[PDB]
Each structure stands twice: as C-alpha cells, then as structure tokens.
C-alpha cells in the first residue's frame, strides 16, 4: 500500500504496543515492497526484541529475519529466524521461507560437519526447534522419500537415527542399500 | 511436497552456479596450463639448444 | 461520525492537560479506524480528511508544547495522508502552512540538505502568490546568502500570522551556527565588529560562550589560539606505510607470477 | 497510376532478405551454437543481440506496409513444430510454407490475427525441448515490431502483449530459475521489455503494480547474480524515482551495496548519469563533477551526441556553481550547440556577475531552462551569482576597498561586505587571514600549490591511488589474455 | 538499452520545429567566420569578445586620451 510512509517508524518507536502490533502486521505487507525503509527502525526492533517486555518475539524476529538478509549477511537473519521461538508457519512457495529453510539446512548440516568430527567433549549446543523445523520439512520430504534424497540428506546431516526410519517404508530394499553404499563410496 | 523441485531445485541451480565457478577454475586451469606448455616448450627449446 | 468533535476542535484551549486526554481519546477511537490510507469504497475520505485535520491541529498543539519526537511523529503520520495515490483529496487551506512548519523543522534540526532536495515537491503551482508560500524559500535562500541583517530588518515584515514567535525560535536555534561561524577566529577579530554583528548589549553571549568555547578574554579583544600551530610529521610513520605500500606492490605486481 | 503501380512491388521485399537471414542466422546460430552445451558457452550472443537491437532501433521498415503488405505478421517461427524427431518432412515444409504465400497473392491482415498468438506455446513453442530459449528467442524479437507505433489505440494491444508475455513465461517464470544463457539473457530481455512498455506505464497510469512487483522479482533475482540484469532492473526503478519519488532515506546511502561488476559498456554512462542526477540535487562539487564528466566521456560506441547533451547540460549547470564554468571546447557536434544556444548568454553571464541586469535577462527570454521544473538550481543561482562573484574576488587581489570593489560588486556597505565575505571564508574552499588593525580587512590569500611544501604527504595518495588504478589495469591486461587462451 | 534516446530525439525535433533553419542561418552568419577555426580558442576569444561586447570593446583608441588624464 504505502511506499514512503514514515509514520510506522514513530509508531514503532512508541510505547503501549497495542498500536505497535497492527502496525507491524501492516508492515509485513509492505516489507516486500520496501525493505530498506525499516533500516532506521532496525535498532529499535532489536531493543524491543532483546528484552522480554514484548509478548510476541516472533513478530520482531520475523521482521528482523526478513530485513537482515535483504540488508546484509544471512547469518544475522538466521540467528533471529532460528531465535524466533515457536513459529507457526505452513509450507509456502515464497522466496523468504525457501531461503530461510535453505540457509537453515545449509547451516544445519554445516554445524553437523563442525560437530561430526568431535563426538565427545566441547559439544556445541544445538537448539531443539532447529531439529523440529528441519525434521518437519525433512519428514515432509520423507512422506514418499521420492527415492532420491532419503539417503542423501540422511548422510549429509551426519545423524545417527535419521536413516533408520527412511528404510522402514521403502521399496526395493536391495536397491536402496546398493544405492546407499554406492553414494557412500563416492563421497 | 514442492521441495525437490523448488528447494532442492534452487539448491541444484546453486550447484549449477558452483559449476560456473568450476568453469572459471576450469578454464583458468586450461589457459594457465597452455601458458605452462608455452613456457615449458621455450625452456625445453633452450634445453635443446 | 462517532461523535461531534467540533466543540473542542476550534476551541483554542491554553491548558494542554485536557488536550492530552482528548488526544489519547482520539488515539483510542482512531486505533481501529485504519490509520493507513484505505482506498476501499472511496467513501472513507471524509473520516480520513477529518482525522487528517484533527491530527493537523493536534500537531499544532504538539509544536505548541515544544515536543520534538511528537512533532516528527504527527508529521510522519500526516505525510501518509499528504502523499496519496488518489488525487481526489481536496487541498486543505492549512496544508501549505503545516508544510511551512515542516520546513521550519527541517531548517531548525540542521537538516537543510533535506530542504535542498525537498524543494522539488513544493512548487506545485497551487497558489504561488501568498507571502507564506515564498517565505521559507526566501528565508532559506537568505540562509544560503547568510545575511542576518535582512532577516532582522525583515522581522517586522511578517503579517499578523501568528508564527512570528516560531520564526524567533528559528533564530534561537540558528544563532548558535551564525554566532559560531562568525566567531571562528582564524587569526583574530576585534570586539568593535562583534558589537554590531552580535546581538544586543545583554551579556548572554559573553557569559554562555565563556563556558562553552572556553577561550581567553584579553583587554576588550578576542584572542585566537591553536590556529595553524600543528607541527608537521617526523616522516617516520609515512615511510613505514610507504614500506607497507611497497610490500603491496610486490604482492599485487607479483602474486600470480 | 503507372508510377506507383509499376514501381510499387520493388520497395516492399527490400528488408525481407536481411530480416529472414537475420532471424535465421541469430536463431539458428544461437540455438545451433549453444544447443550442445548451453551452460558452458555463455555471453557469446549477448553483444550480438544488443547490437542487433541497437542496429534495428533506427529501422524505417514500416512506412507503407499497411496496404496489403502485412503478410509478415501472420507468419512465425514454424521450425520443427509438433514433433521433436523426424524433422525431414518439416525441412521440406520450411520451403513449402514460405513458397505457398508467393504463387499469386496472400490473404493478409493487420489487427485481425493478434490475440491468438498463444496457440503454439500451449502445447509446443518450437520443439518441446528448448522451450525457454526458443520461446523467448521466438516471441520477444517479433513482438515489438507488431507493437510499434505505440499511439493510435495500440496501448490496449500492448496490454494484451503484456498479459501474454507474463502469462506465458514471466507471471513468475516458466520454470522457477532457468539458470542458463537464456536466464542471464532473459534478465536484460525482460528488462528491455520493461523499458519498451515503460512509456505505456508513464503515459496515463503510474507505479502501483509491476515495478512494485519488481522488488519481489528483483530478490526472488538470486543474490548470487553478477547484478548485471539485476542492476538494469534497478535502472528503471531509479528512473521511476527520478521524476517524482523524493524520498531519500532508503535508496540514498542504503541502496549502495557490494556493487558487483555492473558495466554493460553502457550502464556506467547511463546508470552513473542516473545516480549523478539524483546526487546532483544536494550540489555535489567534488564527486559528481569528476565522475559525471567521466560518464560524459564514456559510452562512445553507438552515439555520443544525441544522448550526452543532457548529461552535458546538467554537467555545465552544476559546473557554473563553482565559479569556473568550462564551455564546449573539444566536442564538435550540431546538437549540443543548439541545446546550449539559449543557455549560452547566461552561462557566459555567470562569470561577469551582474545582478540587476542578468536577473531580468534570465526571466526575459527564459522558456525551457526555467520551464524544466521547480526552478530549484536556478533559484539557487539567482543568489549564487554573488557567491561566484565573491569567489572571483577570492581569485582577485587581497585588499578590499569600501568604494572601488564594493561599488564594483554592487554592494556598498561596511557591514555586509565583511559579513558576506566572512560567509565565503567559513566555506573552507578558500584561504584568508582575518585581521583588523585600522578597520580594513586583509587576507593572505596564499593559493601556492604544494610545490616544495610537504610534497610527500601531498601526492602520496596520488601515487597510491594512481598505482592502484594502473595496477588493476595491469589485472585488466592479465585476465583478458587468460580469456583468450582459455579455449586453446 | 539505447531505447531511451527516442524521446530525447523527439525533444530535439521539437527544438528544431520551434525555429525552422533560423538559428542555423543566423548563427551561420558568425559560423562562416568561425568555420575551420579551432573551437578551443573560440572559448577564450568568445569569452573576452562577449565580455567586451557591452562596453569598452576596443579601448585601445581611448588610451591615447587616458594617458594625460590618468
């Protein structure tokens, strides 16, 4: 709707967030139109996000996570997309969701490689919601397994029981173990 | 679904861009090894001298 | 629509404590009334222009109370209604006045660059004959000239329009820059010029500036120190950075090799 | 009757050979070129396509073809359709369908067969295998030809062409990311289309659909792009922000990104002209001067006369602000002359600096340079005349008199003399020694260059910067030889 | 793109339609004395020429009278 509206900055810099909630809800509509206009309110979004005063940390962490990767590196957006707590979001073909799950999987298996060579000692903490949102779309891929990515993504994650549930409901078991070892011997 | 065609699809397209980076490394190896064949042929030529 | 609101609108109340209650009440009523411009059914333009007007006079009390964040708040909220897609909205008689206060705020906050780039939207050829339409551009063009005598002699040229005190606030917020630039003191300046250039005989500048600048006061003269007194370099550090530049020359000149 | 009746059929088939041979050489040459390895060989036909577009921009093709010569419109590719293998009988059909229309006559029309252009792309665009590159390389060349002559109720037909283009490939895309040479080319093809119907956009409507969608399509362009097509898509957004946007809190100093290799051999000139046009409203003296003059000196390939007159006009308009206005000296073309004829009297009148006379001279015959809009920089110039004049006084002798030079500067008063001269001293572009001994204002006005005055610190950054530019030019003479020996 | 030059050339057609060969001939009255001459020097000669076109054009004949008076 709006393009150069600056009133949302003053509404975001204001107390009594009962007016901030619908202002952010309407901000999520024009954020794809103009992502750079929020760069002046990014600092205040971080201020209201770090403290526990605001009740919905996902309304701030989603805006920050959708403006950071539009502004700079995917790391700072990933820390708040993974730091948004409980997020109710269905599967969509949007660029935002596919990029945050793309970098989420890439950095997920990246941490799995950084922690795969160190089985014991100085183990880095991994949040459970990362396993929830990676294993959610992962299981969505494991509805039929498409007979191509089961052992592939099961091997990229370097996890212990990730592939035992894949071979449970699978056709041509000797083809899945022969293709499995064939993929394992070529990496 | 809509992951192997969209998510793994853009992952495969990113793999194609990685194949473009391996085409820059590839042809850099090609022309660097052809210039290497030129210097090797010249130093081998004065070796024949 | 919801109520009259015309009783306390035009009533100029000197006490702003009641206008805070009416203000928050208008925030509670307008809270669900879709602050953002809505083109649905095209019939909401009445409540949108009435809300625009009550936020304009609410900005008038917001600048009457001297609240900097509230002024840019209500101006940032009314800019949403000024910049709109549908041109069917009739131009308010006080719109150019509130934009004049926006230029007053931009020049007051040392944001004159946003004025220089802002000079594009205002020549819309709406009236162009009123003295207040050309007043901010002539005053800011005099600011580009820097001549303060024309402003002081032109102080009594403003009509009965009640923003003369706001112009005096502008002079109060630019006197630090004009007095700061005239007191730069590259080499030296004598008091006999500061008597005329500076303000009246009231010793506010020689008192506040003695604790702000913190300089020496001589025999009825202003001395200037630390002017072109910096000693040149020993040429040792730039020789080291020249050696590092030579390292970068062997690097970039011979890196691939 | 005998003149045009006998000399009527010689004209029409004049462009037929170069248009059929051109579309067959670029079509069969591009598809037959990158058909084996489309992803390996890239950007070979880019300069060919843009050189053919710039070569066909001045085509006088359609002058009389409205009367029974529109037979070129109903025909189309018809290359290996309806079946991918067994194309020998279709190789015969290539001569058959071209020969049928040439026996006696042909039933032709102009505005009749326009909408049913999507009959083939429903099932098979060209061969069902190379659909993207043959779909865009098939549709996109011939569509602006029929869509020529934007006036005369073609705007609606242009909208039909819009919904046909988006509906067939670019509603989002045909496949999410082509990721090939027709993708990297599709960037500048869809962009060039956006410039083609940009006149339709700015004609009666405004920005509320497509260029706003160009942000989602702009970042959907993946961030791994070379930013060539993404930057060309940014050019139409910045030009849409050129006439009246006026918000500067985001694109100004936030649009500034990593800035990848965005050259296009034109995009430095026109893109830098755009960012210098937007950076020309705050009176940029150091950056936009050198970089906009450089952008003026760039883009010599096709035309450096018809388009550079505007960047030259703005260039001298912002050059006369500094007091030193260089006129047209080394360029001889009868376009900037006629463009500068009304502005010549005042741009020559800047240096002399007569307030009362030239103030009337400006509005006297001023029509276009003051009718350009909002009179911003000229209304700043009307009081900048005295600042350039007092800067000429800074380039003049030191001592300032109360009658000779004050009466000469049309300003005879003691207070405003030292006051405004001091307003010129606080700028920092000049050097003066403010001293008051008997009442006269002196000045040292030392404009001596750095010769034998701290030279190492003076041209140190000159040596470092010049060696950096010449050294990246050494990289620019090392890498292209690699791009030479890459294939052999 | 090179497609944005068309409206600029249309503006050139409007400027050419304002006066029909009037500035070409009227300015050609001076161009016939300026043709084949280096246009780099014509900026200085035109600068001082237009500068002295108002008053004191020659001023060399007046020095003989200004010697005894100044």
From Swiss-Prot, chain B:
Domain of life: Eukaryota
Compartments where found: Cytoplasm; Nucleus
Cysteines paired by S-S bonds: none
Biological role: Component of the 26S proteasome, a multiprotein complex involved in the ATP-dependent degradation of ubiquitinated proteins. This complex plays a key role in the maintenance of protein homeostasis by removing misfolded or damaged proteins, which could impair cellular functions, and by removing proteins whose functions are no longer required. Therefore, the proteasome participates in numerous cellular processes, including cell cycle progression, apoptosis, or DNA damage repair.
Family (UniProt): Belongs to the AAA ATPase family.
Subunit structure: Component of the 19S proteasome regulatory particle complex. The 26S proteasome consists of a 20S core particle (CP) and two 19S regulatory subunits (RP). The regulatory particle is made of a lid composed of 9 subunits, a base containing 6 ATPases including PSMC5 and few additional components. Component of a complex with USP49 and RUVBL1. Interacts with PRPF19. Interacts with TRIM5. Interacts with NDC80. Interacts with PAAF1. Interacts, in vitro, with the thyroid hormone receptor (in a thyroid hormone T3-dependent manner) and with retinoid X receptor (RXR). Interacts with ERCC6.
Protein name: 26S proteasome regulatory subunit 8
Organism this protein belongs to: Homo sapiens
Organism taxonomic ancestry: Eukaryota, Metazoa, Chordata, Craniata, Vertebrata
Protein encoded by which gene: PSMC5
From Swiss-Prot, chain C:
Cross-link (Glycyl lysine isopeptide (Lys-Gly) (interchain with G-Cter in SUMO2)): 204
Key words, A-Z: Isopeptide bond, Phosphoprotein, Proteasome, Ubl conjugation
Domain PCI: 69-238
Disulfide bonds: none
GO biological process, one term: proteasome-mediated ubiquitin-dependent protein catabolic process
GO cellular component annotations of the record: cytosol; nucleoplasm; nucleus; proteasome accessory complex; proteasome complex; proteasome regulatory particle; proteasome regulatory particle, lid subcomplex
Phosphoserine PTM sites in chain numbering: 13
Role, per record: Component of the 26S proteasome, a multiprotein complex involved in the ATP-dependent degradation of ubiquitinated proteins. This complex plays a key role in the maintenance of protein homeostasis by removing misfolded or damaged proteins, which could impair cellular functions, and by removing proteins whose functions are no longer required. Therefore, the proteasome participates in numerous cellular processes, including cell cycle progression, apoptosis, or DNA damage repair.
Subunit record text: Component of the 19S proteasome regulatory particle complex. The 26S proteasome consists of a 20S core particle (CP) and two 19S regulatory subunits (RP). The regulatory particle is made of a lid composed of 9 subunits including PSMD8, a base containing 6 ATPases and few additional components. Interacts with DDI2. Interacts with TASOR.
Family (UniProt): Belongs to the proteasome subunit S14 family.
Protein's UniProt name: 26S proteasome non-ATPase regulatory subunit 8
Curated annotation (Swiss-Prot), chain D:
Keyword Phosphoprotein among record annotations: yes
Location of the PCI domain: 269-448
Protein name: 26S proteasome non-ATPase regulatory subunit 3
GO biological process: proteasome-mediated ubiquitin-dependent protein catabolic process; regulation of protein catabolic process; ubiquitin-dependent protein catabolic process
Keywords: Isopeptide bond, Phosphoprotein, Proteasome, Ubl conjugation
Assembly description: Component of the 19S proteasome regulatory particle complex. The 26S proteasome consists of a 20S core particle (CP) and two 19S regulatory subunits (RP). The regulatory particle is made of a lid composed of 9 subunits including PSMD3, a base containing 6 ATPases and few additional components. Interacts with UBQLN1 (via ubiquitin-like domain). Interacts with ERCC6.
Chain residue numbers at which the record places covalent cross-link Glycyl lysine isopeptide (Lys-Gly) (interchain with G-Cter in SUMO2): 21
Pfam families: PCI (PF01399), Rpn3_C (PF08375)
Skewed-composition ranges (Pro residues): 1-15
Cross-link (Glycyl lysine isopeptide (Lys-Gly) (interchain with G-Cter in SUMO1)): 21
Originating species: Homo sapiens (Human)
Similarity comment text for this entry: Belongs to the proteasome subunit S3 family.
Modified residues (Phosphoserine): 401, 413
Molecular functions per Gene Ontology: enzyme regulator activity
Taxonomy, superkingdom: Eukaryota
Stretches for region Disordered: 1-52
From Swiss-Prot, chain E:
Gene Ontology, cellular component aspect: cytosol; integrator complex; nucleoplasm; proteasome complex; proteasome regulatory particle, lid subcomplex; protein-containing complex
Location within or outside the cell: Nucleus
Domain of life per record: Eukaryota
GO terms for biological process, alphabetical: double-strand break repair via homologous recombination; mRNA export from nucleus; proteasome assembly; proteasome-mediated ubiquitin-dependent protein catabolic process
Tissues with expression: Expressed in limb bud, craniofacial primordia and skin.
Quaternary assembly: Component of the 19S proteasome regulatory particle complex. The 26S proteasome consists of a 20S core particle (CP) and two 19S regulatory subunits (RP). The regulatory particle is made of a lid composed of 9 subunits including SEM1, a base containing 6 ATPases and few additional components. Belongs to the TREX-2 complex (transcription and export complex 2), composed of at least ENY2, GANP, PCID2, SEM1, and either centrin CETN2 or CETN3. Component of the homologous recombination repair (HR) complex composed of ERCC5/XPG, BRCA2, PALB2, DSS1 and RAD51. Interacts with the C-terminal of BRCA2.
Family: Belongs to the DSS1/SEM1 family.
The protein's name: 26S proteasome complex subunit SEM1
């Amino acid at each position: 709707m709006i393009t150069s509206a600056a009133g949302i900055i003053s509404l975001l810099d204001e107390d009594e967030p009962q007016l901030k909630e619908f202002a952010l809800h309407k901000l999520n509509a024009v954020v794809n139109d103009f992502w750079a206009e929020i760069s002046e309110s990014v600092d205040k979004i971080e201020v209201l996000y770090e403290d526990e005063g605001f009740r919905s940390r996902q309304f701030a962490a989603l805006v920050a996570s959708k403006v950071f990767y539009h502004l700079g590196a995917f790391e700072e957006s990933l820390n708040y997309a993974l730091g948004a707590g409980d997020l109710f979001n269905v599967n969509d073909n949007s660029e935002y969701v596919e990029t945050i799950i793309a970098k989420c999987i890439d950095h997920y298996t990246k941490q799995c490689v950084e922690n795969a060579d160190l089985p014991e000692g100085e183990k880095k903490p991994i949040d459970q919601r990362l396993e929830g949102i990676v294993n959610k779309m992962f299981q969505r891929c494991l509805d039929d397994h498409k007979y191509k990515q089961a052992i592939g993504i099961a091997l990229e994650t370097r996890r212990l029981d990730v592939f035992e549930k894949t071979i449970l409901e699978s056709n041509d078991v000797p083809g899945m173990l022969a293709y499995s070892l064939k993929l394992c011997m070529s990496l | 679904l809509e992951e192997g065609k969209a998510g793994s699809g853009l992952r495969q397209y990113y793999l194609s861009k990685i194949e473009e980076l391996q085409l820059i490394v590839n042809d850099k190896s090609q022309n660097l090894r052809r210039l290497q064949a030129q210097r090797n042929e010249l130093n081998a030529k004065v070796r024949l001298l | 629509m919801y109520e009259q609101l015309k009783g306390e609108w035009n009533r100029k109340s000197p006490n702003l404590s009641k206008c805070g209650e009416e203000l928050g009440r208008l925030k509670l009523v307008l809270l669900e009334l879709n602050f953002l411009p809505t083109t649905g059914t095209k019939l909401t333009k009445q409540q949108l222009i009435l809300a625009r007007d009550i936020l304009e006079i609410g900005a008038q009390w917001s600048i009457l109370r001297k609240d900097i964040p509230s002024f840019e708040r209500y101006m940032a909220q009314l800019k949403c209604y000024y910049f709109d897609y549908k041109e069917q909205l009739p131009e308010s008689a006080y719109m150019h006045q509130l934009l004049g206060l926006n230029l007053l705020f931009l020049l007051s906050q040392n944001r004159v660059a946003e004025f220089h780039t802002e000079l594009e939207r205002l020549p819309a050829k709406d009236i162009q004959t009123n003295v207040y339409i050309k007043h901010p551009v002539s005053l800011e063009q005099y600011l580009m000239e820097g001549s303060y005598n024309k402003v002081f002699l032109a102080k009594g040229n403003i009509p009965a329009e009640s923003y003369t005190f706001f112009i005096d606030i502008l002079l109060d917020t630019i006197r630090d820059e004009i007095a700061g630039c005239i007191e730069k003191a590259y080499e030296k300046i004598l008091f006999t010029e500061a008597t005329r250039i500076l303000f009246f005989n009231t010793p506010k500048k020689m008192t506040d500036y003695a604790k702000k600048r913190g300089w020496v006061l001589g025999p009825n003269n202003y001395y200037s120190f630390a002017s072109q007194q910096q000693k040149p370099e020993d040429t040792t550090i730039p020789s080291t950075e020249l050696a590092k530049q030579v390292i970068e020359y062997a690097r970039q000149l011979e890196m691939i090799v | 009757p005998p003149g045009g009746g006998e000399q009527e059929p010689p004209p029409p088939p004049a462009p037929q050979d170069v248009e059929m041979k051109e579309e067959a050489a670029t079509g069969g040459g591009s598809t037959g070129e990158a058909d084996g390895k489309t992803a390996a060989a890239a950007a070979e036909h880019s300069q060919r396509e843009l050189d053919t577009v710039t070569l066909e921009d001045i085509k006088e093709h359609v002058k009389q073809l409205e009367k029974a010569v529109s037979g070129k419109e109903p025909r189309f590719v018809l290359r290996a359709l309806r079946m991918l293998p067994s194309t020998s009988r279709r190789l015969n059909h290539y001569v058959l369908y071209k020969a049928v229309q040439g026996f006696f006559t042909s039933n032709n029309a102009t505005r009749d067969f326009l909408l049913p252009f999507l009959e083939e792309p429903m099932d098979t665009e060209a061969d069902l295998q190379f659909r993207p590159r043959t779909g865009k390389a098939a549709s996109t060349p011939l569509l602006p030809e029929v869509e020529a002559y934007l006036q005369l109720l073609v705007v609606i037909f242009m909208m039909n062409s819009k919904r046909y283009k988006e509906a067939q490939k670019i509603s989002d895309d045909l496949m999410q990311k082509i990721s090939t040479q027709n993708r990297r080319a599709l960037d500048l093809v869809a962009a060039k289309c956006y410039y083609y119907h940009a006149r339709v956009y700015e004609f009666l409507d405004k920005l509320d659909v497509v260029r706003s969608f160009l942000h989602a399509r702009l970042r959907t362009a993946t961030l791994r792009h070379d930013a060539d097509g993404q930057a060309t898509l940014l050019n139409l957004l910045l030009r849409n922000y050129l006439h009246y946007s006026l918000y500067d809190q985001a694109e100004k100093l936030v649009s500034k990104s990593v800035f990848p290799e965005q050259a296009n051999n034109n995009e430095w000139a026109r893109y830098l002209y755009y960012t210098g046009r937007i950076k020309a409203i705050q009176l940029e003296y150091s950056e936009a001067r050198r970089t906009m003059t450089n952008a003026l000196r760039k883009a010599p390939q096709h035309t450096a006369v018809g388009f550079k007159q505007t960047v030259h006009k703005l260039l001298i308009v912002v050059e006369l602000l500094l007091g030193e206005i260089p006129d047209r000296l080394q360029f001889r073309q009868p376009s900037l002359k006629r463009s500068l004829m009304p502005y010549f009297l005042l741009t020559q009148a800047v240096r002399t600096g007569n307030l009362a006379k030239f103030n009337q001279v400006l509005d006297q015959f001023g029509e276009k340079f003051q009718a350009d809009g909002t009179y911003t920089l000229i209304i700043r110039l009307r009081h900048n005349v005295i600042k350039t004049g007092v800067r000429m006084i800074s380039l003049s002798y030191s001592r300032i008199s109360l009658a000779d030079i004050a009466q000469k500067l049309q300003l005879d008063s003691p207070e405003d003399a030292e006051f405004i001269v001091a307003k010129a001293i606080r700028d920092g572009v000049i050097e003066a020694s403010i001293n008051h001994e008997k009442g006269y204002v002196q000045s040292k006005e030392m404009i001596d260059i750095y010769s034998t005055r701290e030279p190492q610190l003076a041209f140190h950054q000159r040596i470092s910067f010049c060696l950096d530019i010449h050294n990246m030019s050494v990289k620019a003479m090392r890498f292209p030889p690699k791009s030479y020996n890459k294939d052999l | 793109m090179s497609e944005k030059k068309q409206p600029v050339d249309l503006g050139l057609l409007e400027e050419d339609d304002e006066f029909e060969e009037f500035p070409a001939e009227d300015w050609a009255g001076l161009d016939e004395d300026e043709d084949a001459h280096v246009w780099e020097d014509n900026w200085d000669d035109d600068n001082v020429e237009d500068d002295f076109s108002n008053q004191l054009r020659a001023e060399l004949e007046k020095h003989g009278y200004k010697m005894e008076t100044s």
